Amino acid sequence: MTTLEEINLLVERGYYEEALAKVYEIEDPIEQVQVLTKIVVTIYQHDGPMEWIPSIMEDAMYIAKKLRDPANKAVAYSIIASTLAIMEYEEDAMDFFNRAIDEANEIESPIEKGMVLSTLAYHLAIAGYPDNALEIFNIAFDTIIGAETSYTHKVDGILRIGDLLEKAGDTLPSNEAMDFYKMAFDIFDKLHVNQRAAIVEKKIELAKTVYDVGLPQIRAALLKGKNHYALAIIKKKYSGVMRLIGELEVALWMKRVNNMEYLDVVDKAFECCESPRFTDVNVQHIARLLTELGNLRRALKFAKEIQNIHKRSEALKAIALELVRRKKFEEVKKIIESIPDPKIREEALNEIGTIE
């Protein structure tokens, strides 16, 4: 721990050769590989001396080659694999992932095998290979669940897959993160860790609500309630239509965690800029967002501009139902008459027969 501090400091001072010389004062090999690869990654990312990278990866590769114990080797190869994948050496990454797999299949304990697989799956996700990651997480899971030990030994192994599924999810954008979160929740639900199930359930509503702009650092900020920070990222990374939708999705999430400042974000999302140019799908999307937000005035403006006759029918109904719940009937009838699909117009006319 102080050794890691000395190594970091030597790096900050650009004394790379000495830092690497100290890496051997680290006891654990896997830890040596972690350190070595984290140096490479920060160099690659913060434009440090790129010509150190090959020599360091060689050192890491050498440490992994000497390992002997199948589990350790598998993790080491995984660490090497995801860092190559970060740096876009895809053929080499998949080579090391396959080495990791082979070593995993040498493990005797199925619970041990399962554990190693989920780590490797986690590295596949870090690497930007979400589909491969899932496949491996599922094999990891099948490996533990199929084993012939007693209930209790399987339990801790499977909860650890849960934790890793969840962390993989957290590092992914919403569309990719969703499958990881569902598996984790499933695991936490069946295995009776309710505190953990609740958090993941919440990360799913969040990923679902803030979807298009659901960058992992944005979802992370929203979950902490650092709303202005996330909004800030959205202004930096998006403009026009995507910036509008993103701000609305954020307002919607704020609304659902009972933060009443969401009203402000909505007004600003329209009042900040000129109305961009919209595709019909953008129109539909904004109409739905504004409805769930409760801004039925704006939501109606958008719904009436939906060109797809069926989508328009749907959006007009939703708005009208919400009107009913919240009184304000003086516009309901006209809106229903407006629905182009008479079938739908009838369904809305029955649902308004809520006895409530």
Coordinates of C-alpha atoms in Angstrom, one line a residue:
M1 CA 0.0 0.0 0.0
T2 CA 2.8 2.4 0.7
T3 CA 4.7 0.6 -2.1
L4 CA 1.8 1.5 -4.4
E5 CA 2.2 5.1 -3.3
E6 CA 5.9 5.1 -4.1
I7 CA 5.2 3.7 -7.5
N8 CA 2.5 6.2 -8.3
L9 CA 4.7 9.1 -7.2
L10 CA 7.7 7.9 -9.3
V11 CA 5.3 7.8 -12.3
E12 CA 4.0 11.3 -11.6
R13 CA 7.6 12.5 -11.6
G14 CA 8.1 10.6 -14.9
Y15 CA 10.6 8.2 -13.4
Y16 CA 9.1 5.2 -15.2
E17 CA 12.1 2.9 -15.2
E18 CA 12.3 3.2 -11.4
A19 CA 8.6 2.7 -10.9
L20 CA 8.8 -0.5 -12.8
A21 CA 11.8 -1.6 -10.8
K22 CA 9.7 -1.3 -7.7
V23 CA 6.9 -3.3 -9.0
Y24 CA 8.8 -6.4 -7.9
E25 CA 8.7 -5.2 -4.3
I26 CA 5.0 -6.1 -4.7
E27 CA 4.3 -9.5 -3.2
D28 CA 1.4 -10.8 -5.2
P29 CA 1.9 -11.5 -8.9
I30 CA -1.7 -10.6 -9.8
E31 CA -1.1 -7.4 -7.9
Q32 CA 2.0 -6.8 -10.0
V33 CA 0.0 -7.3 -13.1
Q34 CA -2.8 -4.9 -11.9
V35 CA -0.2 -2.3 -11.3
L36 CA 1.7 -2.8 -14.5
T37 CA -1.4 -2.6 -16.6
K38 CA -2.8 0.5 -14.8
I39 CA 0.4 2.3 -15.6
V40 CA 0.0 1.4 -19.3
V41 CA -3.7 2.5 -19.3
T42 CA -3.1 5.9 -17.8
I43 CA -0.2 6.5 -20.3
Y44 CA -2.4 5.5 -23.2
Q45 CA -5.2 7.7 -21.9
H46 CA -3.4 10.8 -20.7
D47 CA -0.9 11.0 -23.5
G48 CA 2.2 10.0 -21.5
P49 CA 5.2 8.4 -23.2
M50 CA 3.6 5.7 -25.4
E51 CA 7.0 4.1 -26.1
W52 CA 7.0 2.5 -22.6
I53 CA 3.8 0.5 -23.3
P54 CA 5.3 -2.5 -25.2
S55 CA 8.0 -3.1 -22.6
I56 CA 5.5 -3.0 -19.7
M57 CA 3.0 -5.3 -21.4
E58 CA 5.9 -7.7 -21.9
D59 CA 6.7 -7.6 -18.2
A60 CA 3.0 -8.2 -17.3
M61 CA 2.8 -11.0 -19.9
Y62 CA 6.0 -12.6 -18.4
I63 CA 4.5 -12.5 -14.9
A64 CA 1.3 -14.2 -16.1
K65 CA 3.3 -16.8 -18.0
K66 CA 5.2 -17.9 -14.8
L67 CA 2.1 -18.2 -12.7
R68 CA 1.3 -22.0 -12.6
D69 CA -2.0 -21.9 -10.6
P70 CA -4.8 -21.9 -13.1
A71 CA -7.1 -19.5 -11.3
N72 CA -4.4 -16.8 -10.9
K73 CA -3.2 -17.2 -14.5
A74 CA -6.8 -16.9 -15.7
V75 CA -7.2 -13.6 -13.8
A76 CA -3.8 -12.3 -14.9
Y77 CA -4.6 -13.1 -18.6
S78 CA -8.0 -11.4 -18.1
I79 CA -6.3 -8.3 -16.8
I80 CA -3.9 -8.2 -19.7
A81 CA -6.8 -9.0 -22.1
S82 CA -9.0 -6.0 -21.1
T83 CA -6.2 -3.5 -21.2
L84 CA -5.2 -4.6 -24.7
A85 CA -8.9 -4.2 -25.7
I86 CA -8.9 -0.8 -24.1
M87 CA -6.0 0.1 -26.4
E88 CA -7.8 -1.4 -29.5
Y89 CA -5.5 -4.5 -29.9
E90 CA -8.5 -6.6 -30.5
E91 CA -6.8 -9.7 -31.9
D92 CA -4.4 -9.8 -29.1
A93 CA -7.1 -9.2 -26.5
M94 CA -9.2 -12.1 -27.7
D95 CA -6.0 -14.2 -27.7
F96 CA -5.6 -13.5 -24.0
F97 CA -9.3 -13.9 -23.3
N98 CA -9.0 -17.4 -24.8
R99 CA -6.0 -18.1 -22.7
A100 CA -8.0 -17.1 -19.7
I101 CA -10.9 -19.4 -20.7
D102 CA -8.4 -22.4 -21.2
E103 CA -6.9 -21.9 -17.8
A104 CA -10.4 -21.6 -16.2
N105 CA -11.3 -25.0 -17.7
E106 CA -8.4 -26.5 -15.8
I107 CA -9.9 -25.6 -12.4
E108 CA -11.2 -28.6 -10.4
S109 CA -13.6 -26.9 -7.9
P110 CA -16.7 -25.9 -9.9
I111 CA -17.3 -23.1 -7.4
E112 CA -13.7 -22.0 -7.9
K113 CA -14.2 -22.2 -11.7
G114 CA -17.4 -20.2 -11.5
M115 CA -15.7 -17.4 -9.6
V116 CA -12.8 -17.2 -12.0
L117 CA -15.2 -17.2 -15.0
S118 CA -17.3 -14.2 -13.6
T119 CA -14.0 -12.2 -13.2
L120 CA -13.1 -12.9 -16.7
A121 CA -16.7 -12.0 -17.8
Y122 CA -16.2 -8.8 -15.8
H123 CA -13.0 -8.1 -17.8
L124 CA -14.8 -8.9 -21.1
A125 CA -17.3 -6.2 -20.2
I126 CA -14.6 -3.6 -19.2
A127 CA -13.1 -4.5 -22.6
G128 CA -16.2 -3.3 -24.4
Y129 CA -17.4 -6.8 -25.3
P130 CA -20.8 -6.9 -23.5
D131 CA -22.3 -9.8 -25.5
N132 CA -19.3 -12.1 -24.8
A133 CA -19.3 -11.0 -21.2
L134 CA -22.9 -12.1 -20.7
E135 CA -22.2 -15.5 -22.3
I136 CA -19.4 -16.1 -19.9
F137 CA -21.4 -14.8 -16.9
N138 CA -24.0 -17.3 -17.8
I139 CA -21.5 -20.2 -18.1
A140 CA -20.1 -19.0 -14.7
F141 CA -23.6 -19.2 -13.2
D142 CA -24.4 -22.6 -14.8
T143 CA -21.1 -23.9 -13.5
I144 CA -21.9 -23.1 -9.8
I145 CA -25.6 -23.9 -9.9
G146 CA -24.9 -27.3 -11.5
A147 CA -22.2 -28.3 -9.0
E148 CA -22.9 -31.1 -6.6
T149 CA -22.0 -29.4 -3.3
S150 CA -24.6 -28.3 -0.8
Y151 CA -26.9 -25.2 -1.1
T152 CA -24.9 -23.0 1.2
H153 CA -21.6 -23.2 -0.7
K154 CA -23.3 -22.3 -4.0
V155 CA -24.9 -19.3 -2.3
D156 CA -21.8 -17.1 -1.8
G157 CA -20.4 -18.0 -5.2
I158 CA -23.6 -16.9 -7.0
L159 CA -23.9 -13.6 -5.0
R160 CA -20.4 -12.8 -6.1
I161 CA -21.6 -13.2 -9.7
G162 CA -24.4 -10.8 -8.8
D163 CA -21.9 -8.2 -7.5
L164 CA -19.8 -8.5 -10.7
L165 CA -22.9 -8.5 -13.0
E166 CA -23.9 -5.3 -11.3
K167 CA -20.5 -3.6 -11.6
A168 CA -20.2 -4.6 -15.2
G169 CA -23.6 -2.9 -15.7
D170 CA -22.4 0.2 -13.9
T171 CA -19.6 0.6 -16.4
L172 CA -21.8 0.2 -19.5
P173 CA -24.2 2.5 -21.3
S174 CA -27.9 1.9 -20.5
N175 CA -28.7 -0.2 -23.6
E176 CA -25.8 -2.5 -22.9
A177 CA -26.2 -2.4 -19.1
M178 CA -29.7 -3.6 -18.9
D179 CA -29.1 -7.3 -19.4
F180 CA -26.4 -7.3 -16.6
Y181 CA -28.7 -5.6 -14.2
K182 CA -31.6 -8.0 -14.8
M183 CA -29.4 -11.0 -14.1
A184 CA -28.0 -9.4 -10.9
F185 CA -31.4 -8.5 -9.6
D186 CA -32.7 -12.0 -10.4
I187 CA -29.8 -13.3 -8.3
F188 CA -30.2 -11.0 -5.4
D189 CA -33.9 -11.6 -5.4
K190 CA -33.8 -15.4 -5.4
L191 CA -30.9 -15.5 -2.9
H192 CA -32.6 -13.1 -0.3
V193 CA -30.2 -10.2 -0.2
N194 CA -33.0 -7.5 -0.2
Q195 CA -30.7 -4.4 0.3
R196 CA -28.8 -5.3 -2.8
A197 CA -31.9 -6.2 -4.8
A198 CA -33.4 -2.8 -4.0
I199 CA -30.4 -0.8 -5.3
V200 CA -30.3 -2.8 -8.5
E201 CA -34.0 -2.4 -9.0
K202 CA -33.4 1.4 -8.7
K203 CA -30.4 1.2 -11.2
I204 CA -32.8 -0.4 -13.7
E205 CA -35.5 2.3 -13.4
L206 CA -32.6 4.8 -13.8
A207 CA -31.1 3.1 -16.8
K208 CA -34.6 2.8 -18.3
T209 CA -35.4 6.5 -17.6
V210 CA -32.1 8.0 -18.7
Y211 CA -31.5 5.7 -21.7
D212 CA -30.3 7.7 -24.8
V213 CA -27.9 9.7 -22.8
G214 CA -27.3 7.0 -20.2
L215 CA -23.6 7.1 -20.2
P216 CA -22.2 5.2 -17.2
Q217 CA -20.7 8.4 -15.6
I218 CA -24.1 10.2 -16.1
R219 CA -26.1 7.3 -14.4
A220 CA -23.5 7.3 -11.6
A221 CA -23.9 11.0 -11.1
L222 CA -27.7 10.8 -11.1
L223 CA -27.8 8.0 -8.6
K224 CA -25.7 10.1 -6.2
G225 CA -28.1 13.0 -6.8
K226 CA -25.3 15.1 -8.4
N227 CA -27.8 16.4 -11.0
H228 CA -26.1 19.5 -12.1
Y229 CA -22.9 17.6 -12.7
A230 CA -24.8 15.1 -15.0
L231 CA -26.6 17.9 -16.8
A232 CA -23.2 19.5 -17.3
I233 CA -21.9 16.4 -19.1
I234 CA -25.0 16.3 -21.3
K235 CA -24.4 19.9 -22.5
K236 CA -20.8 19.0 -23.2
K237 CA -21.4 15.7 -25.0
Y238 CA -24.7 16.4 -26.8
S239 CA -26.5 19.2 -28.7
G240 CA -29.9 19.8 -30.4
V241 CA -32.4 16.9 -30.3
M242 CA -30.2 14.5 -28.2
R243 CA -29.5 17.3 -25.7
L244 CA -33.2 18.0 -25.4
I245 CA -34.2 14.4 -24.9
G246 CA -31.4 13.9 -22.5
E247 CA -32.3 16.9 -20.4
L248 CA -36.0 15.7 -20.3
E249 CA -35.0 12.1 -19.3
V250 CA -33.0 13.7 -16.5
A251 CA -35.9 15.8 -15.4
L252 CA -38.0 12.7 -15.4
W253 CA -35.6 10.9 -13.1
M254 CA -35.4 13.8 -10.8
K255 CA -39.2 13.8 -10.7
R256 CA -39.3 10.2 -9.7
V257 CA -36.8 10.6 -6.8
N258 CA -39.1 13.4 -5.6
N259 CA -36.7 16.3 -6.5
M260 CA -39.0 19.2 -7.3
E261 CA -36.2 21.1 -9.1
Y262 CA -37.1 18.9 -12.1
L263 CA -39.6 21.6 -13.1
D264 CA -36.7 24.0 -13.7
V265 CA -34.7 21.5 -15.9
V266 CA -37.7 21.1 -18.2
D267 CA -38.2 24.8 -18.7
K268 CA -34.5 25.3 -19.3
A269 CA -34.4 22.4 -21.8
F270 CA -36.7 24.4 -24.1
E271 CA -35.8 27.9 -23.1
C272 CA -32.0 27.4 -23.5
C273 CA -32.0 27.0 -27.3
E274 CA -33.9 27.3 -30.5
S275 CA -36.2 24.4 -31.2
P276 CA -34.1 21.9 -33.2
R277 CA -35.3 20.0 -36.2
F278 CA -37.1 16.8 -35.4
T279 CA -37.6 13.4 -36.8
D280 CA -41.0 11.9 -36.2
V281 CA -39.5 9.5 -33.8
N282 CA -38.0 12.4 -31.9
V283 CA -41.4 14.0 -31.8
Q284 CA -43.0 10.8 -30.5
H285 CA -40.3 10.4 -27.9
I286 CA -40.6 13.9 -26.6
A287 CA -44.4 13.6 -26.5
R288 CA -44.1 10.5 -24.3
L289 CA -41.5 12.2 -22.1
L290 CA -43.6 15.3 -21.6
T291 CA -46.6 13.2 -20.7
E292 CA -44.8 11.1 -18.1
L293 CA -43.4 14.4 -16.8
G294 CA -46.9 15.8 -16.4
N295 CA -46.4 18.7 -18.8
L296 CA -49.6 18.0 -20.7
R297 CA -49.6 21.4 -22.4
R298 CA -46.3 20.8 -24.2
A299 CA -47.0 17.1 -24.6
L300 CA -50.1 18.0 -26.6
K301 CA -48.2 20.3 -28.9
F302 CA -45.8 17.4 -29.7
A303 CA -48.4 14.7 -29.9
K304 CA -50.4 16.7 -32.6
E305 CA -47.2 16.8 -34.8
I306 CA -46.7 13.0 -34.8
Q307 CA -47.0 12.0 -38.4
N308 CA -47.4 8.2 -37.9
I309 CA -51.2 7.8 -37.6
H310 CA -50.9 5.0 -35.0
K311 CA -48.3 6.6 -32.8
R312 CA -50.3 9.8 -32.8
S313 CA -53.4 7.9 -31.8
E314 CA -51.5 6.3 -28.9
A315 CA -50.0 9.6 -27.6
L316 CA -53.3 11.4 -27.8
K317 CA -55.0 8.7 -25.7
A318 CA -52.3 8.7 -23.0
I319 CA -52.5 12.5 -22.6
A320 CA -56.3 12.2 -22.4
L321 CA -56.2 9.5 -19.7
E322 CA -53.8 11.6 -17.6
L323 CA -56.2 14.5 -18.0
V324 CA -59.0 12.4 -16.5
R325 CA -57.0 11.4 -13.4
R326 CA -56.2 15.0 -12.7
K327 CA -59.6 16.5 -13.4
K328 CA -59.2 19.3 -16.0
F329 CA -61.9 17.8 -18.2
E330 CA -62.6 20.9 -20.4
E331 CA -60.2 19.6 -23.1
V332 CA -60.7 15.8 -22.8
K333 CA -63.6 15.4 -25.2
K334 CA -62.0 17.3 -28.0
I335 CA -58.8 15.3 -27.6
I336 CA -60.6 11.9 -27.8
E337 CA -62.5 13.0 -30.9
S338 CA -59.1 13.8 -32.3
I339 CA -57.8 10.2 -32.1
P340 CA -57.5 9.0 -35.8
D341 CA -57.8 5.4 -34.8
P342 CA -61.5 4.9 -33.9
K343 CA -60.7 1.6 -32.3
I344 CA -58.2 3.3 -29.9
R345 CA -60.6 6.2 -29.6
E346 CA -63.1 3.7 -28.1
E347 CA -60.6 2.1 -25.7
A348 CA -59.8 5.6 -24.4
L349 CA -63.6 6.1 -24.1
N350 CA -63.9 3.0 -21.9
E351 CA -60.9 3.6 -19.7
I352 CA -62.3 7.1 -18.9
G353 CA -65.0 5.0 -17.4
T354 CA -62.8 4.5 -14.3
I355 CA -65.2 4.2 -11.4
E356 CA -62.6 5.9 -9.3

